[PDB]
Design a protein around this ligand. Structure first.
Ligand code: ZN
Lengths: 50, 109, 69, 89
RNA sequence: ACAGCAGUUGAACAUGGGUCAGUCGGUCCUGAGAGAUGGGCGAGUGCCGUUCCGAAGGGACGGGCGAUGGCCUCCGUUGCCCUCGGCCGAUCGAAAGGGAGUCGGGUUCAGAUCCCCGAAUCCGGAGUGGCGGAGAUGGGCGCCGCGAGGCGUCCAGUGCGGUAACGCGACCGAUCCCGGAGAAGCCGGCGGGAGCCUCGGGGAGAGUUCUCUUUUCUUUGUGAAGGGCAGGGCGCCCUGGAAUGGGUUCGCCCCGAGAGAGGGGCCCGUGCCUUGGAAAGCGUCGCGGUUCCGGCGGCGUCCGGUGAGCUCUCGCUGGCCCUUGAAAAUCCGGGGGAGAGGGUGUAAAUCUCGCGCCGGGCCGUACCCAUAUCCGCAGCAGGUCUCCAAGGUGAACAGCCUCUGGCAUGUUGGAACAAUGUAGGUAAGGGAAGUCGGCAAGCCGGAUCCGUAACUUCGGGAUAAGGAUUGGCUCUAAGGGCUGGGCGGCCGGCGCCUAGCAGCCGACUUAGAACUGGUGCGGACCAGGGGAAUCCGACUGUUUAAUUAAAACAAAGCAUC
RNA sequence: UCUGGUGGAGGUCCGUAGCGGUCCUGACGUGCAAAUCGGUCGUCCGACCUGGGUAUAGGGGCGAAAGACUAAUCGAACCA
């Protein structure tokens, strides 16, 4: 809701910032094994632990 | 456009009495026109008339009070009936003084 | 907003060190002299044009004057 | 309007005839206005059970549940006056 | 890739961006309750307990006794001692309870009572007085001054008015004490105010004009905070003394404990005018620059009437209760008079009066709020708390049609119209012969006028049962409000409103009649079939969420322990 | 005593919103749905309906009582 605490807002801020795709240059790093961000979270599909 | 021309034409006819018969009534007589509002309006008319008659000294306090309780007792249907009854009382009171003065004149003669 | 009904009171309000500006407005029927102070906007309504021009001349110096034309 | 039901016509047929008859006596006394012994005006109504108020002199009196004065109260008041007078004289 | 067809689309994917407050909430207070310490219990983590087995105050008028700093004659800060002093105990507990104070106009791609413009407001601080005003500036004795007006002395002065209710711009005062406000249910009925709807005109724009319609549609403002005036209310006051009782409400109700009558007082004032205010907003007609100028300009934003109308709100007055419908923070008033001030200055202490100066930190704020942003594994016919609520018909927030606003038929389309099905209808003559059973469907249905049985706990049964009417059109009768009563007035006998007369204004109904249609008319919509009995339970209520709503449970009453 | 008014009582009646869930033993029954849909129904000022906050926890609670309910789990839940 609009009414939220500071602790909850800071928790939602962090999940928002970590929902980004992998950068393109990571694939070029020597000995790289990551192809995509397997921890992508969609708001409608998966809900937060909160 | 949402014209009110049709409803205004029907309201004019309805004010004349049209579309208001037995076949056009769905609510009861009390739902359409409450008996309490009819009674309360009637008392306000008749009590107002009695107050004006008292103020202008057409009737006195003792005639006002008896007529007030008869109005509360549903004796007079409307203002016209109450006006005629007051006039009959005024004639009777005048007559009682007419034969009183006649009797006093005869006795003193 | 406060309404002042005396010219003498208006001059006192205008000469306050708090006063910031005098705004003159001309209407169809009256002329309104408005002095803006810290707390209230003081308005004087004058229905005579002869007295209106006199008030402009007697306005205190230095105080900003704006004509709402 | 009614032959015998009186004030308990509000209950219709919903309880026994004898129960409606018993409550008829109590409901008349619990809603009646009595004459105030302090100011003389007939305005002594019931606020709650055992509480009686006068709307003119604003006096509140502890009384009966449904009647202003219980018979037990009158006898006790008369008896206490006798016991007090015997102590004095 | 996903959105079960597509997709130039998306609540998908990618890149950027977006939430601004003293006056909107949180924050503060307590509620039901939760919970430490003291104490007790407990092998023990710990538990019980919330005033109960505690030396539970750390504060403060004021006074004294000392240090210290200053616009240092003096005052202020800091320690110690008297005086006062119940926390009737920490603390937590509400984004719907309590709780000071903000509202118009504009502005964005997305913010906004938060930004800009404008106009206000509350709280706190101001010591070294911020400026005014108040307190507060009189009287007596003389002298001089022609006299006014000044010189000396003495004595007052913590305001004033009204018979009163109370009023005026302030109008000292501590510990202590009393009170108020915060702070009270549900239902009914009336009345006031506003918003909306309605009606009659006047503007501006638009629609229709085949014929008519001087028409039909849209639009036709003034925030908070001050000031004044209506209006509403009053168990507020003064005169006075009432039965031939009177006053008065829709209902009531009121009076020698003071009616009616007259004259005042107070509270609320969300209404009107006014400052704010037209400069802004809107409507319409034009003229510019250029993407935006809150561009510029002209005209307008008018006058009325209605009402058991609906909604909100403010009042008054009742009904019900073996039901009586929070608490605390916080704020205020009063009682008392411990104190302080100055000796007549142009003065003091003091001031809840007017204006002036400074500040108001932290957190929330975007959007969905649901037949697609929430839960049900999903864009799931399920579930999920509220606010505003137009016209017509009509008892209605019923159903049916429409306007403002919204939408694209609910995860696809094309063609055809077979059986069986799901949903909706109709049917000759019979009229339950079907079937366990009238299951299902059908009949009745509104309103008005008549007329209503057995039985009964006398309340009911009851819309019992049964019958008639119902359209359209044209009339008639009845049902009300205001004003007046012998150029402008008025000193006057000269007038007499008196079966209530004249003029003006107005809305909603009721009853009766004529005419009239292929007897059709509660024409759609809405909308009880009924009667005679038996069994059970008295009734209202409740129950196995997801097969049993019942005769089961409860219940008032009765009785027992 | 009778009559005509006024008045507005009630765990009162018809009946919206709301709450519930009779019958069709209708639809659906690899459903829209691990209980939904339609018509028809009960109640609708009260023992009424409902949000939030609080309290009661497993041989325990709560129960106008059906062994009902206690997170799709109840003649003793769920987790290890
Ligand atoms: Zn009394």
């Amino acid at each position: 809701s609009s009414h939220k605490t500071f602790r909850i807002k800071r928790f939602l801020a962090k999940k928002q910032k970590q929902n980004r795709p992998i950068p393109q240059w990571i694939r070029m790093k020597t000995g790289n094994k990551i192809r995509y961000n397997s921890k992508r979270r969609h708001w409608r599909r998966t809900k937060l632990g909160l | 456009v949402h014209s009110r021309a049709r409803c205004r034409k029907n309201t004019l006819a309805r004010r004349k009495g049209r579309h208001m018969g037995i076949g056009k009534r769905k609510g009861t007589a009390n739902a359409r026109m409450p008996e309490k509002v009819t009674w309360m309006r009637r008392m306000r008319i008749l009590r107002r008339l009695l107050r004006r008659y008292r103020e202008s000294k057409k009737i006195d306090r003792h005639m006002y009070h008896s007529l007030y309780l008869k109005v509360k007792g549903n004796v007079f249907k409307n203002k016209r009936i109450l006006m005629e009854h007051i006039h009959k009382l005024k004639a009777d009171k005048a007559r009682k003084k007419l034969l009183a003065d006649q009797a006093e004149a005869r006795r003193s003669k | 907003p406060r309404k002042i009904e005396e010219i003498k009171d208006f001059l006192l309000t205008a000469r306050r060190k708090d006063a910031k500006s005098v705004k003159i407005k001309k209407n169809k029927d009256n002329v309104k002299f408005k002095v803006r102070c810290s707390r209230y906007l003081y308005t004087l309504v004058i229905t005579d044009k002869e007295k209106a021009e006199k008030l402009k001349q007697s306005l205190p110096p230095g105080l900003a004057v704006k004509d709402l034309k | 309007r009614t032959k015998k039901v009186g004030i308990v016509g509000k209950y219709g047929t919903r309880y026994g005839a004898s129960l409606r008859k018993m409550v008829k006596k109590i409901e008349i006394s619990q809603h009646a206005k009595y004459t105030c012994s302090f100011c003389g005006k007939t305005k002594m109504k019931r606020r709650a059970v055992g509480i009686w108020h006068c709307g003119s002199c604003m006096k509140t009196v502890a009384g009966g549940a449904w009647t202003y004065n219980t018979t037990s109260a009158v006898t006790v008041k008369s008896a206490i006056r006798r016991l007090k007078e015997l102590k004095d004289q």
